[PDB]
Amino acid sequence: SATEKYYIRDAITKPAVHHESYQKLWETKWKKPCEMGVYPFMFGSIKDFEPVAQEIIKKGLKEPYDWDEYAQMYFPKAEELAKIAEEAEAAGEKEKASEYYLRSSAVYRISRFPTPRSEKQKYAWRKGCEVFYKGAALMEYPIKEVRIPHKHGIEGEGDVVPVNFLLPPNASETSPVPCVLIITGLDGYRTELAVWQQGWRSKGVATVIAEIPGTGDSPALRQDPTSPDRQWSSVLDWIESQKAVDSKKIVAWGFSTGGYYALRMAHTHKDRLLATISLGGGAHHMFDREWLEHANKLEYPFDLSNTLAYKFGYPDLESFIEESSKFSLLNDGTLQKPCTKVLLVNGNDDEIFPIDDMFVSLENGQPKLARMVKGKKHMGEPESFSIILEWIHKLLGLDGKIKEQLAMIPS
Ligand SMILES: Oc1cc(O)c2c(O)cc(O)cc2c1
Numbered sequence: 103s104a105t106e107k108y109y110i111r112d113a114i115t116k117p118a119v120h121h122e123s124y125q126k127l128w129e130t131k132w133k134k135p136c137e138m139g140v141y142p143f144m145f146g147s148i149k150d151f152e153p154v155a156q157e158i159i160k161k162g163l164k165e166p167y168d169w170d171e172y173a174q175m176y177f178p179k180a181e182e183l184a185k186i187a188e189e190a191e192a193a194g195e196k197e198k199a200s201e202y203y204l205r206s207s208a209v210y211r212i213s214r215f216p217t218p219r220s221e222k223q224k225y226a227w228r229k230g231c232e233v234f235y236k237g238a239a240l241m242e243y244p245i246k247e248v249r250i251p252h253k254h255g256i257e258g259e260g261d262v263v264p265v266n267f268l269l270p271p272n273a274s275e276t277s278p279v280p281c282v283l284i285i286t287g288l289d290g291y292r293t294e295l296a297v298w299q300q301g302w303r304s305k306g307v308a309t310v311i312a313e314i315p316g317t318g319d320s321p322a323l324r325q326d327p328t329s330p331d332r333q334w335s336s337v338l339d340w341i342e343s344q345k346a347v348d349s350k351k352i353v354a355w356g357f358s359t360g361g362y363y364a365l366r367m368a369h370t371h372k373d374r375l376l377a378t379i380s381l382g383g384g385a386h387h388m389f390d391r392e393w394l395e396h397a398n399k400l401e402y403p404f405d406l407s408n409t410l411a412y413k414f415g416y417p418d419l420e421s422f423i424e425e426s427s428k429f430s431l432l433n434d435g436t437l438q439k440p441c442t443k444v445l446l447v448n449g450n451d452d453e454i455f456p457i458d459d460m461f462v463s464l465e466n467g468q469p470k471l472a473r474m475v476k477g478k479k480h481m482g483e484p485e486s487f488s489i490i491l492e493w494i495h496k497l498l499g500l501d502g503k504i505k506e507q508l509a510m511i512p513s
Pocket residue numbers: 140141287290295357358480481483
């Protein structure tokens with residue numbers, strides 16, 4: 103059956119305990135990364151989240167979640183942190199203001215995980231973005247929003263591609279810098295992957311952070327497989343206009359679902375990218391009935407397959423599965439085209455997207471760079487981040503000081 107189909111075999115039939123309740127999500131999956139200040143709790147503090155978790159656990163919330171009831175639990179804490187930030191900014195305490203705005207943005211973020219599917223989650227997205235950019239503007243090296251005109255947009259698409267932008271100091275047309283284009287995931291948007299930007303700045307590298315179609319503020323048509331292609335044309339046209347960036351040194355790094363888009367654009371925009379990295383991406387079997395019919399109950403904190411269906415613009419999973427084959431980079435002929443430099447990295451035991459899709463990626467077109475991480479699930483952490491930074495440092499001729507860069511990630 104499905105138990106024989108994929109690399110992980112009958113692991114797909116074992117429901118993960120975190121789906122039983124929020125209590126199990128918190129105790130077995132979220133408390134630890136929150137304490138360490140890492141994804142999905144970048145910029146966050148256990149001091150903020152633990153009191154909120156305790157209130158959710160007392161209420162006994164669990165799948166199926168009422169996303170308005172769920173989101174509202176985070177709001178009193180998010181507002182408290184935003185009020186503290188405002189009073190700090192009024193007093194000229196810039197470093198403190200920045201911290202509490204970003205702590206507020208983290209609480210709003212988790213309130214609209216896994217993706218905004220209710221009015222209060224849609225509200226939390228807007229409120230989280232607002233406090234993130236207030237925090238970002240008060241960083242020593244401010245990260246700014248750029249509303250890139252979507253010149254390549256068609257009917258029914260948004261007029262702009264909102265991105266984060268950070269340019270290292272002394273970057274100029276005379277001394278231009280490489281750019282890491284970060285493509286975000288199904289749940290982590292530009293307000294989350296922002297955590298990478300100061301690291302890249304410290305190594306003399308510009309960053310642009312953009313969301314995938316049907317997430318954050320992406321203007322792209324959800325159901326149209328070619329919508330990302332138009333988005334990257336607008337984004338890369340804008341990066342080329344920034345003369346302080348070397349347009350011959352753009353590296354696209356796709357995180358999780360972002361990996362699919364990084365792999366896709368290595369083909370669609372080969373001549374405009376030095377390299378792309380897919381970290382925990384998929385390509386083909388991520389759209390399989392069998393995979394999607396099992397993934398709701400596996401390592402993903404909530405309902406992966408339903409969330410992916412919503413991101414692709416479908417009202418339910420069955421309707422998505424009916425048409426999902428058309429998004430395959432194999433089915434649509436993408437993987438037959440020439441590609442720029444591609445690095446594929448993932449944990450073998452991934453239960454969000456199958457390692458089988460790294461195999462499909464290596465079974466078609468030109469040879470690609472790969473590191474498989476045995477005995478690890480989605481993203482193959484922490485070794486994956488060291489592998490990728492080492493490769494990008496070598497590619498761009500940076501200082502190779504990847505431990506220094508990685509140490510800047512934990513909040
Ligand atoms: O350690 C990480 C860091 C991330 O940025 C992740 C992300 O964006 C998506 C995901 O599914 C897992 C992640 C794990």
